[PDB]
RNA sequence: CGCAAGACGGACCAGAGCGAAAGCAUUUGCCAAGAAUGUUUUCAUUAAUCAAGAACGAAAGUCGGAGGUUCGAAGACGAUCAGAUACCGUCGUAGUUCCGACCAUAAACGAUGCCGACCGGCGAUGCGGCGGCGUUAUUCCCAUGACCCGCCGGGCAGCUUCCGGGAAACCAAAGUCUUUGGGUUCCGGGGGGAGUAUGGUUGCAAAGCUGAAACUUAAAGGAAUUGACGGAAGGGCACCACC
């Protein structure tokens, strides 16, 4: 998620690095990459429920 | 103007009348003797040509089509016909 | 309970040496207390300076966005961050019974400063002209607009961001467009009404100090 | 509040943002940038009634209460950015702008350049009020 | 009866025009229909151009004007006395008065 | 602003709310070039002398 | 009575007659 | 200062254009279409208007999917008031935005069917064409543009007038009408009842289209005129007005 722009539609998103795909992986669901933080290395991602 | 010469109009009046509206319907177009300074003969090109005129023996293009009277390549002399 | 102006340092704001007049103004900033540094909170102020205060004795209706790109100490080093018109000028030009023409160009120089230039072109009423209207045919407007666009790809791609601004302080782009459209529809009030800075490359301090020298 | 400026007769500038709407008048002197501010006292901070917040008298007391703070904090000259309510609403400044601009001029604050930064829409989102207008 | 020969507006061969939101109201008046004033004006009216030039930095700096185009509805043009009820003959006069 | 005097050259008519203020073209007694228009109370005629506390204010000409 | 609302009161009144014919059908 | 969103396309913008009407305004590309003009092209009456039948048809509304920045029916509240479940203020549901189906109505108005002819003038403009000194840019000349003087055709308009018409207002059409006939479609017959009841038909629905009667009533109505009145705009005047 670090190496893609904001507003990027993703799915089978990892909630933690290495857990091998947990979030936004039911039929017709998507998570939007909202905004990045290169310092601290973190990203806001809007989940299918609508909670960043 | 009550008494007008609808019988015998002046020639300048039948320039201010449309080609359909003239007392005897006559066109405003003409034929002309167009030559090019390239070759030595004369061809007949229509005034409102509306097509390209390829010169004899595949020389060049003479007459370029426009909205009304098609243009002539600069130097091409035109002489209006008698009939 | 306490004065925030017992902490405020007043620093010189340097124009780049491509302009004539040096001083712009002195800007208050809080000193270092905590993590943040006074330079850090001072390395992104867009200074909107009129041409006549920035360049000796010329037209005063053109303005220039200037970002404080790197702060040294007691000096704020600006850089051409865009060009603006005074609305008093821009709104005085859009008057009725003529054709307003506009053209935008997304263009990038040799040094990777992708500008977005905005030309404007107002169709002129001739001297002997009696006709009130003085409008252009749709095709004539987009023959002029296509001509505007080629010029601003011919003066921005073809040289670097320092050499475009010395065309922008005069009307080197706003005169070129005016002359080359006299044959399509003769138009008078041509400027380049706005330049917006979009994409700068990776910041190197040397090229900034080279603008200030 | 000490600057390193020479103080014979040289002008320390500072742009001011006059939000002169029809129900209040702001006089907001900032730095040439605008990113750091100095003092912002309005028509509603001087008078404690609502029907003369936009009044020419309120914005005079505002711009005089601006000028004294502006004098002490090392500023000599003023750039002026007059503003309307702007957007889909009115684009013409209110009844306190001229009284405000004069009030700091009569104080002795030097007047640099003036302009309108009224946030005019190129094209507008639907203005508040009905199809049939504001009936009164 | 038909009081005007035009329909108090400036469409003749359209069918439809864009609506304008009025300045006094927010009425939806057709553009051609609406009463229009392109108001050009100095930032001060008369009494303040004296003093603002005296405490100006630059030597004889001409001040900016205020170019705003007003759109009055028929109800808010006649209330604010922009337009006015002329005589049944003098309505026809499309002459902007000096 | 010290106390000047201004001499009436001609009255330009009666203005105000209840017709009381003579709007008067006054001539400064110092310089006979700078002449202003001001609001004068009472019965006012031509040639007489107002006391202006300033040279600054100028009436709205009708 | 406006001719626009006279219409509206006939439309409600007709709506009430389809309502009350259905009670028998 | 950056950012993300969904709307919208000011000023330029006009009694300007286009489209059958509704409607249509950021740049460019693309894809068909269209009139007007030009035509010493071609077919040679193929046309006009049209029951039945059909295409499109603002807004609102309905169904589903997506989207929801602003605005905002319903609705919550604060005012105003005797009351306001109204106007006014802050919020906000449907909707407003788009995709695919529905609906077929508007003061959908120029309240003016369409095709044709004839009958005044005047100055403009829009599109094409034609011709004419000169001014101007491409300068290094032609031809094009920009203007400038006209003309023709077509269009939107405008002014004018004893064309004539009409109840007049007004209208170069609403004229060419008791001197009554160019062709043709729809359509009205005092006011109401009533666009209702009823029957069919259309639609998911809201509702559309077709559509009476019993009864009721001596007027409803149009244009204009004079007055009175106005919480319309002015212009006056008066110590039974003010200052």
Question: Can you give the three-state secondary structure of chain B, one letter per residue?
Answer: CCCCCCCCCCCCCCCCCCCCCCCCCCCCCCEEEECCCCCCCCEEEECCCCCCCECCCCCCECEECCCCCCEECCCCCCCECCC
CB C175 within 7 Å, strand H: no
Two tokens, residue D87? 């957007």
- Chain E neighbors of D122, CB-CB under 8 A: none
* C and D: number of Cβ contacts within 8 A: 53
Per the structure, the count of domains in chain F is 1
Structure determination method: cryo-EM
What is the rounded CA–CA span in Å between residue B78 and residue B83?
15
Q: Dihedral sign, CA of C163, C165, C167, C169?
A: negative
Residue A10's DSSP bridge partners are: A31
F58 in contact with chain E, both atoms CB, cutoff 8 A: yes
Judge contact between D77 and D13, C-beta under 8 A.
yes
Neighbours of chain F (3+ CB pairs under 8 A): E
What is the rounded CA–CA span in Å between residue C135 and residue C147?
18
Q: How close C183 gets to chain D, by Cα (Å)?
A: 31
What range does the domain containing F4 cover? 1-62
Q: Could you say which residues from 70 to 129 on chain C have a Cβ atom under 8 Å away from some Cβ of chain E?
A: 86-88, 91-92, 96
Length C37 CA → H114 C1' (Å)? 83
Neighbours of chain A (3+ CB pairs under 8 A): none
Separation in Å, CA E59 to CA C40, C171, D16, E64: 38, 25, 21, 15
The number of beta carbons lying within 10 Å of the beta carbon of residue C128 is 4
CB C138 within 7 Å, strand H: no
Of residues D11, D113, D130, nearest to E26 (C-beta): D130
Say if domain E1-98 classifies as CATH 1.10.3720.10: no
> What DSSP character marks residue C6?
G
Strands C80-85 and C62-67: antiparallel
Separation in Å, CA F46 to CA A23, F5, F10, F12, F37: 94, 15, 5, 11, 14
Mutate to test the interface with D, among E57, E59, E72 (most CBs of D within 10 A): E57
What is the rounded CA–CA span in Å between residue C107 and residue C152?
8
Supply the CATH number for residue F7's domain.
2.40.50.140
E76 carries a ligand binding annotation:
yes
Residue C83's DSSP bridge partners are: C64, C195
Fold classification of D2-136 is: Nucleotidyltransferase; domain 5 (3.30.420)
- Cβ-defined contact of E46 to F57 (cutoff 8 Å): no
Two tokens, residue D114? 């003036």
What is the rounded CA–CA span in Å between residue C116 and residue C83?
10
Q: Which residue is nearest to nucleotide H196 (CA to C1')?
A: G10
What is the rounded CA–CA span in Å between residue B36 and residue D126?
67
- The three-class DSSP label of residue G2 is coil
The residue ranges of every structural domain in chain D are 2-136
> What DSSP character marks residue C204?
-
- Dihedral, B55, B59, B63, B64 alpha carbons, nearest 10: 140
Q: How close C48 gets to chain E, by Cα (Å)?
A: 17
Strands C191-199 and F6-15: unpaired
CA C179 to the chain's CA centroid = 21
B39 carries a ligand binding annotation:
yes
D125 in contact with chain E, both atoms CB, cutoff 8 A: no
Judge contact between D42 and D106, C-beta under 8 A.
no
Strands B71-72 and E68-72: unpaired
- Concatenate the DSSP letters of all residues of C64-131 into one string: EEEE--EE-SSEEE--EEEEEE-HHHHHHH--SSS-EEEEEEEE--SSS-EEEEEEEEEBPPPSS---
Neighbours of chain B (3+ CB pairs under 8 A): none
- Cβ-defined contact of D116 to E45 (cutoff 8 Å): no
Judge contact between F38 and F50, C-beta under 8 A.
yes
Contacts of D106 (CB under 8 A, 6+ apart): E51, E55
Which nucleotides of chain H have an atom under 7 angstroms from any protein CB?
Answer: 1-19, 21-29, 37-40, 69-73, 87-90, 96, 109-112, 124-131, 134-138, 142-149, 151-153, 155-160, 169-171, 174, 194-198, 206-207, 222-224, 232-234, 242-243
What is the rounded CA–CA span in Å between residue G7 and residue F56?
69
E28 carries a ligand binding annotation:
no
What is the rounded CA–CA span in Å between residue C32 and residue D75?
23
CB B27 within 7 Å, strand H: yes
- Concatenate the DSSP letters of all residues of E14-76 into one string: -S---EEE-SSS--EEETTTSEEEEE--BSS-SSSHHHHHHTBSSTT-PPPB--EEEEE-HHH
Judge contact between C119 and C102, C-beta under 8 A.
yes
Separation in Å, CA B24 to CA B13, B14, B17, B30: 13, 9, 11, 17
> What DSSP character marks residue A13?
B
Two tokens, residue C79? 């850089």
Residue B19: nearest nucleotide (C-alpha to C1'): H152
Task: Write down how long chain B is.
Answer: 83
Q: How many Cα atoms occupy the beta-carbon half-sphere of A33 within 13 Å?
A: 17
What is the rounded CA–CA span in Å between residue G25 and residue G12?
20
Two tokens, residue D136? 């009164």
- Cβ-defined contact of C91 to E38 (cutoff 8 Å): no
Q: How close C127 gets to chain D, by Cα (Å)?
A: 33
CA angle G4, G9, G11 (to 5 degrees): 95
Strands C62-67 and C46-50: antiparallel
Separation in Å, CA D43 to CA D26, D34, D100, D125: 7, 21, 9, 29
Phi/psi for C145 (5° steps) reads -65, -40
Q: From 2.60.120.10, 2.20.25.100, 2.40.30.170, 1.20.1250.20, which CATH number describes the B1-83 domain?
A: 2.20.25.100
Q: How far apart are the first and last CA of chain B?
A: 35
What is the rounded CA–CA span in Å between residue F29 and residue F6?
6
User: Quick check: do C and E touch, 3+ CB pairs under 8 A?
Assistant: yes
Strands C80-85 and C75-77: unpaired
Closest CA to F48 of F31, F23, F13, F24: F24
Helix pair C138-154, C172-180: axis angle to 10 deg: 140
């Amino acid at each position: 998620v670090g190496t893609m722009p904001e507003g990027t539609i993703v799915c089978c998103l990892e909630e933690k690095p290495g857990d091998r795909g947990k979030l936004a992986r039911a039929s017709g669901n998507y998570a939007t990459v909202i905004s990045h933080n290169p310092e601290t290395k973190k990203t806001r991602v809007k989940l299918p429920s609508g909670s960043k | 103007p009550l008494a007008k010469d609808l019988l015998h109009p002046s020639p300048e009046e039948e320039k201010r009348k449309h080609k359909k509206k003239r007392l005897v319907q006559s066109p405003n177009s003409y034929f002309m003797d167009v030559k090019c300074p390239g070759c030595y003969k004369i061809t007949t090109v229509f005034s409102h040509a509306q097509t390209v005129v390829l010169c004899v023996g595949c020389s060049t293009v003479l007459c370029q089509p426009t909205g009304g009277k098609a243009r002539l390549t600069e130097g091409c002399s035109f002489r209006r016909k008698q009939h | 309970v306490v004065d925030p102006f017992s902490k405020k340092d007043w620093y010189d704001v340097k124009a780049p040496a491509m302009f004539n007049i040096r001083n712009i103004g002195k800007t208050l900033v809080t000193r270092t207390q905590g993590t943040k540094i006074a330079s850090d909170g001072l390395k992104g102020r867009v200074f909107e300076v009129s041409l006549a205060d920035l360049q000796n004795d010329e037209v005063a209706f053109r303005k220039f966005k200037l970002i404080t790109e790197d702060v040294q100490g007691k000096n704020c080093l600006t850089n051409f961050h865009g060009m603006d018109l005074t609305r008093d000028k821009m709104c005085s030009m859009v008057k009725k019974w003529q054709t307003m023409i506009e053209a935008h160009v997304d263009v990038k120089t040799t040094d990777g400063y992708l500008l977005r230039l905005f030309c404007v072109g107002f169709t002129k009423k001739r001297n002997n002209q009696i006709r009130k209207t003085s409008y252009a045919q749709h095709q004539q407007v987009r023959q002029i607009r296509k001509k505007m666009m080629e010029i601003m790809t011919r003066e921005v791609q073809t040289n670097d961001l320092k050499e475009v601004v010395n065309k922008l302080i005069p009307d080197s782009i706003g005169k070129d467009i005016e002359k080359a459209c006299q044959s399509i529809y003769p138009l008078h009030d041509v400027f380049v009404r706005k330049v917006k800075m979009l994409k700068k490359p990776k910041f190197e301090l040397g090229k900034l100090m080279e603008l200030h020298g | 509040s000490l600057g390193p400026q020479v103080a014979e007769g040289e002008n320390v500038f500072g742009v001011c943002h006059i939000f002169a709407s029809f129900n209040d008048t702001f006089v907001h002197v900032t730095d040439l940038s605008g990113k750091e501010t100095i003092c912002r006292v309005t028509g509603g901070m001087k008078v404690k009634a609502d029907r003369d917040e936009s009044s020419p008298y309120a914005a005079m007391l505002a711009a005089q209460d601006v000028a004294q703070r502006c004098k002490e904090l090392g500023i000599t000259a003023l750039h002026i950015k007059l503003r309307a309510t702007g957007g889909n609403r009115t684009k013409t400044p209110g009844p306190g702008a001229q009284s405000a601009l004069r009030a700091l001029a009569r104080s002795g604050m030097k007047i640099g350049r003036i302009e309108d930064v009224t946030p005019i829409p190129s094209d507008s989102t639907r203005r508040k009020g009905g199809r049939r207008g504001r009936r009164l | 009866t038909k009081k005007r020969r035009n329909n108090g507006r400036a469409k003749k061969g359209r069918g439809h025009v864009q609506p304008i939101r009025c300045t006094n109201c927010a009425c939806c008046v057709p553009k051609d229909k609406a009463i229009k004033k392109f108001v050009i004006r100095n930032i001060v009216e008369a009494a303040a151009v004296r003093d603002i030039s005296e405490v100006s930095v630059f030597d004889a700096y001409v001040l900016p004007k205020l170019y705003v185009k007003l759109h009055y509805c028929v109800s808010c043009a006649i209330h604010s006395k922009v337009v006015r009820n002329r005589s049944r003959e003098a309505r026809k006069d499309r002459t902007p008065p000096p | 602003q010290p106390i000047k005097l201004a001499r009436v050259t001609k009255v330009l008519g009666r203005t105000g709310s209840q017709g009381q203020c003579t709007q008067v073209r006054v001539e400064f007694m110092d310089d006979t070039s700078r002449s202003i228009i001001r609001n004068v109370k009472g019965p006012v005629r031509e040639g007489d002398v107002l006391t202006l506390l300033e040279s600054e204010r100028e009436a709205r000409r009708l | 009575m406006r001719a626009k609302w006279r219409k509206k009161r006939m439309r409600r009144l007709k709506r009430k007659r389809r309502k009350m014919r259905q009670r028998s059908k």
